Amino acid sequence: MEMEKEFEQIDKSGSWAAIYQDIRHEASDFPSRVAKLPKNKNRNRYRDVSPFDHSRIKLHQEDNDYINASLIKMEEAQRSYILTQGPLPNTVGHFWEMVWEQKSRGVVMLNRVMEKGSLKCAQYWPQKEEKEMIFEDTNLKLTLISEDIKSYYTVRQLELENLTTQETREILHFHYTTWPDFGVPESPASFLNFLFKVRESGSLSPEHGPVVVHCSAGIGRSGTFCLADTCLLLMDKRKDPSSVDIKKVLLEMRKFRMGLIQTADQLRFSYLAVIEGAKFIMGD
Numbered sequence: 001m002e003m004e005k006e007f008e009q010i011d012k013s014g015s016w017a018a019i020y021q022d023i024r025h026e027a028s029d030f031p032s033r034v035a036k037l038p039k040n041k042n043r044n045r046y047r048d049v050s051p052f053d054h055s056r057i058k059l060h061q062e063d064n065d066y067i068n069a070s071l072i073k074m075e076e077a078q079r080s081y082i083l084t085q086g087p088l089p090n091t092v093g094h095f096w097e098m099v100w101e102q103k104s105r106g107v108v109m110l111n112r113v114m115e116k117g118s119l120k121c122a123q124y125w126p127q128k129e130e131k132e133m134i135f136e137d138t139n140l141k142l143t144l145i146s147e148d149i150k151s152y153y154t155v156r157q158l159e160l161e162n163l164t165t166q167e168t169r170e171i172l173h174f175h176y177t178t179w180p181d182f183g184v185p186e187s188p189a190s191f192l193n194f195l196f197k198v199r200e201s202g203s204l205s206p207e208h209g210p211v212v213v214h215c216s217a218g219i220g221r222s223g224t225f226c227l228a229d230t231c232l233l234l235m236d237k238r239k240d241p242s243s244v245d246i247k248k249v250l251l252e253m254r255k256f257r258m259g260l261i262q263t264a265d266q267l268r269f270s271y272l273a274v275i276e277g278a279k280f281i282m283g284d
């Protein structure tokens with residue numbers, strides 16, 4: 001069923017809450033035993049948001065390999081994503097270790113450091129060229145190279161150095177700065193413009209490790225970004241773009257990380273983004 005008609009039918013009936021609860025009921029439940037070990041309590045931002053054991057990213061160290069991060073592998077779309085929480089004061093070194101080890105070219109940030117008057121993630125990148133950051137626990141150095149500030153997002157060029165080998169890499173930081181403190185954006189136009197900027201950079205392409213995507217918990221805004229990207233890629237690849245079922249793609253992605261899309265309003269916004277984005281994909 002053409003999702004644009006499915007959309008008007010749900011809107012006219014006001015059943016968004018009912019559709020959303022159906023997804024919550026059918027979603028996968030896999031063990032997260034490593035996340036719940038007592039040694040890992042200060043590595044989790046939220047007690048109710050944990051990576052499944054089968055899909056968690058492992059750090060390459062013998063001490064403790066744990067980070068709150070999941071590999072989402074989309075087989076038909078041929079895209080992979082790492083979804084993670086906003087870094088904590090004691091996990092900023094782990095965060096950059098993961099980016100290094102997974103060979104990522106792009107970090108996508110969908111939150112502000114402070115929202116609703118509270119801290120939603122650590123200040124984990126340098127704000128001035130001449131004041132670099134050193135992560136002594138993981139042996140990494142991070143330098144700000146350049147910053148491009150736009151009305152709805154900022155792009156930063158960063159240099160990550162493995163101090164152990166003196167190898168250096170250029171990491172692109174894509175920061176969406178205008179998601180409102182409450183609710184979802186009224187129009188998906190600026191979110192789709194942002195998605196297209198990340199794509200145009202190479203950060204989502206198979207020649208690089210998976211993009212790292214985060215918000216505060218790494219399930220709500222982060223879920224909206226990967227769901228919209230994968231649905232638009234499937235509409236490009238298939239003979240019948242009308243066969244793409246956003247609810248079935250979301251349930252496939254929930255096999256790899258719990259809780260993706262946190263509200264009925266985030267679910268409606270995801271439909272709007274895919275419907276408006278398709279009017280490019282189909283030749284405009």
Ligand SMILES: O=C1NC[C@H]2CCN(C(=O)c3ccccc3)CC[C@H]12
Pocket residue numbers: 103104105168169170171208209
């Ligand atoms: O695998 C990688 N992950 C982070 C990357 C760090 C910096 N690199 C580049 O900016 C680059 C140059 C030419 C062609 C394509 C990419 C090289 C590839 C590295």
